[PDB]
Ligand binder design. Structure first.
Ligand SMILES: [Mg+2]
Ligand SMILES: [Mg+2]
Ligand SMILES: [Mg+2]
Ligand SMILES: [Mg+2]
Ligand SMILES: [Mg+2]
Ligand SMILES: [Mg+2]
Ligand SMILES: [Mg+2]
Ligand SMILES: [Mg+2]
Ligand SMILES: [Mg+2]
Ligand SMILES: [Mg+2]
Ligand SMILES: [Mg+2]
Ligand SMILES: [Mg+2]
Ligand SMILES: [Mg+2]
Lengths: 109, 139, 195, 145
RNA sequence: GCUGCGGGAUGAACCGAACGCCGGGUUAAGGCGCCCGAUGCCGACGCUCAUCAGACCCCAGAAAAGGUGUUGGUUGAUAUA
RNA sequence: AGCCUCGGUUGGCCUCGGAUAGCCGGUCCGGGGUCCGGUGCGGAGUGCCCUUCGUCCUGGGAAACGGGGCGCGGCCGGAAAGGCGGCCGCCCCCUCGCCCGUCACGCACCGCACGUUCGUGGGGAACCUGGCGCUAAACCAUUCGUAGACGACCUGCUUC
């Protein structure tokens, strides 16, 4: 029981001012607001979980409407605790302002 | 109003910086933005630190202005600041914060389990005290 | 899941920037008591700025032009909209997350209010600087409900005073009970791990 | 990760249970076990990178682990009678594995020695009974495990 | 012109830089309150209050003159007779 | 029972007000005096519910409110955009629901993902069953002109 992941918001892709890079995404993880605090989350897996109308097979249990996009944390971003990530497939633009759960599967400490 | 003052012989606490969490002694004021600090018995060398970097305390020591280390450490030991520093409600709160930060998983579990026993008895006694006060104010 | 931010004492732009950045993330923000938002500068200076803004208007059809609002909540809403990308679908969807309101209504009097110290006038402006209250500034230009706003604020304050008196009595009884049950409650763990 | 350390099983099918670590096998996987009386987890193989090690320690040096169990002792074997398709599910997964007298023997041999070491700690049998979880007030980058 | 790209909001000539299709790292010019990526640094010193403040080469606004409004400097003259 | 939607994985039930000042506690005559706390600990770097897998036997501390409510009565408690919470009298009953210790069990799925949550989520079409109630109004046609380019708008019909 109980939550086993950290909360993070999708603010946008890695971008300049007049161009975007959809391969890399930026994540604002709750509780981290400094550069010296994001070293714990480097390499952690991330999951963008959503629901569709057609049920798909799940690794455990009956098929469900849940669909997840997997990725992981690549490096840090800025000094305000923001972090970077790269998923198997680029995140849809509708996920901006939504939650990607940061797991703790790759454990170092 | 303004019960604390910087002066020759004021012991202050370093809130942030390279020597954060230590006490220093203000020898003299330099340029109304930084002051020379000694801190002989707190393991820090003589240097200049900004006023906004330090936090004032209540204890004051008798130093001559621009005094040497052999003359400031003697007065520090005469005032006996270190042992009386632990016997205050401020260093106790600081150490409490350090311990709460040093909490481990077993410690958090034990605290959570002790809260169940502590808060419930307090609540059941408050429920009795409130009814006692109501019965007292009833007539 | 909501952020009930108090309005009094906060600077207009200093608070609106924080709210506009926090709304684009997904947090539903409700700014309460917008009539107390202070604005830096002279009151006559801010009045002249607002009048120069009022002068701007489409010539051929004023109704189909810049809509000037008179309520301070709507003023703060327009200030936040000026920073949000309202011409895009993302900004349009984020604009509903912000709820600017005058006074403290029933749905929000019982909720504890938050204060953002990064926008407080005490830390933003020098004590010798002049500031203007958004409530008075709006009332001087086409706002009519300042009297009823102040009356309802007085009512809710007189209610919250009694609520706080009851809470303080409960706290006193709790401290008395804690001092009473000294035995049977050791809780050396609470002191060793510092609460 | 030292012999006698508490671990949290995050990615396993137990989803955040506290177990005791015994020893490291030869293939690189950790052989852990939780007291079946405390938490219903048998002698389980876990991964090193997939567990969180808590700073708590248990005196386990006198574990006296057997030598017959190894990486080959923990395997998943699947067999089927027919080659084509049929109604029954391979005649094997229908009646799940229930091998006994060997999975219970070593378990009863190890827990009767582990429990006298766990029950000596004042509040360890409840700590291991509990299940770890992330509440709203704390974050792992500030929490000390 | 024969020339895309990153900054100057906007752009023919400005500043960097020149161009096959991609992944990782870094950077020039420029920038880090929100539009919009990054100062959410317990940043340093000092100046400034406007009832027309000010905010970055080309670039999109201004002069002679004046201020007992403040902030520095120089030459000088008086004062325990 | 089935279909569409997209989002969350405990909730924070509240004095006003200043920043060259204020908080708490209180004998006395809303204010004054005194006593604690004051880089805020009666503190949101906070506090309560809490991190609980379940069932059974049996010991210590606490507990006389009992503990959940498809239940009843009294108050509307609160109008700026109100509906949950408290008290008292009973109701089917209840002293392992809390903390520590104790003998014995359960999906021990054999290393793995989309797991655990306010979901008796919002919306729409019907299916079998109980109790209490309802039996219309618009538009068109016609007429009127206080209005009308056409629409629109102002009005009448009863068998006395
Ligand atoms: Mg009008
Ligand atoms: Mg030509
Ligand atoms: Mg050429
Ligand atoms: Mg060129
Ligand atoms: Mg360009
Ligand atoms: Mg050049
Ligand atoms: Mg060039
Ligand atoms: Mg590249
Ligand atoms: Mg540069
Ligand atoms: Mg940004
Ligand atoms: Mg001028
Ligand atoms: Mg320009
Ligand atoms: Mg031009």
């Amino acid at each position: 029981s109980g939550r086993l992941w950290c909360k993070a918001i999708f603010a946008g892709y890695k971008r300049g001012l007049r161009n975007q890079r959809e391969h890399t995404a930026l994540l604002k993880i709750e509780g981290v607001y400094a550069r010296d605090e994001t070293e714990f989350y480097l390499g952690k897996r991330c999951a963008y979980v959503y629901k569709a109308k057609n049920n798909t097979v799940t690794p455990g249990g009956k098929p469900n409407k849940t669909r997840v996009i997997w990725g992981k944390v690549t490096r840090a971003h800025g000094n305000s605790g923001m972090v970077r990530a790269k998923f198997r497939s680029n995140l849809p633009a509708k996920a901006i302002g939504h939650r990607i759960r940061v797991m703790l599967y790759p454990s170092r400490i | 109003v303004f019960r604390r003052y910087v002066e020759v012989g004021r012991v202050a606490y370093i809130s942030f910086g390279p020597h954060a969490g230590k006490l220093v002694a203000i020898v003299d004021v330099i340029d109304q933005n930084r002051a020379l600090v000694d801190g002989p018995c707190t393991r820090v060398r003589r240097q200049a630190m900004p006023f906004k970097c330090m936090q004032l305390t209540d204890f004051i020591l008798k130093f001559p202005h621009s005094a040497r280390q052999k003359y400031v450490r003697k007065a520090w030991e005469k005032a006996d600041i270190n042992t009386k520093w632990a016997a205050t409600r401020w260093a106790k709160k600081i150490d409490a914060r350090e311990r709460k930060a040093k909490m481990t998983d077993f410690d958090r579990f034990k605290v959570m389990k002790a809260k169940k026993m502590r808060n419930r008895i307090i609540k059941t006694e408050v429920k009795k005290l409130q009814r006692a006060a109501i019965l007292k104010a009833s007539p | 899941q909501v952020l009930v931010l108090d309005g009094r004492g906060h600077l207009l732009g200093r608070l609106a920037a924080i709210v506009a950045k926090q709304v684009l993330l997904g947090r539903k923000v409700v700014v309460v008591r917008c009539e107390g938002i202070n604005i830096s500068g002279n009151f006559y200076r801010n009045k002249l700025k607002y009048l120069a803004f009022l002068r701007k208007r489409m010539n051929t059809n004023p109704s189909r032009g810049p809509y000037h609002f008179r309520a301070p909540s709507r003023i703060f809403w327009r200030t936040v909209r000026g920073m949000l990308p309202h011409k895009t679908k993302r900004g349009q969807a984020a604009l509903e997350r912000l709820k600017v309101l005058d006074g403290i209504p029933p749905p929000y009097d019982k909720k504890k209010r938050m204060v953002v110290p990064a926008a407080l006038k005490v830390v933003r402006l020098k004590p010798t600087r002049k500031f203007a209250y958004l409530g008075r500034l709006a009332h001087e230009v086409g706002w009519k409900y300042q009297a009823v706003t102040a009356t309802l604020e007085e009512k809710r304050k007189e209610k919250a005073k009694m609520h706080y008196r009851k809470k303080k009595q409960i706290l006193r009884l709790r401290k008395q009970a804690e001092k009473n049950v000294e035995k049977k409650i050791c809780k050396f763990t609470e002191v060793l791990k510092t609460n | 990760i030292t012999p006698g350390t508490v671990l949290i099983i995050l990615t396993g099918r137990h989803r955040g249970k506290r177990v005791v670590f015994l020893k490291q096998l030869d293939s690189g996987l950790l052989l852990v076990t939780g007291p079946l009386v405390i938490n219903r987890v048998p002698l389980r193989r876990t991964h090193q990178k997939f567990v969180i090690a808590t700073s708590t320690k248990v005196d386990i040096s006198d574990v006296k682990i057997p030598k017959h169990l190894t990486d080959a002792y923990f395997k998943k074997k699947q067999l089927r009678k027919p080659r084509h398709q049929e109604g029954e599910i391979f005649d094997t997964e229908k009646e799940k594995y229930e091998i006994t007298e060997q999975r219970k023997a070593d378990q009863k041999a190890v827990d009767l020695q582990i429990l006298p070491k766990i029950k000596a700690v004042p509040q360890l049998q409840g700590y291991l009974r509990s299940q770890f979880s992330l509440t709203n007030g704390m974050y792992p980058h500030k929490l000390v495990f």
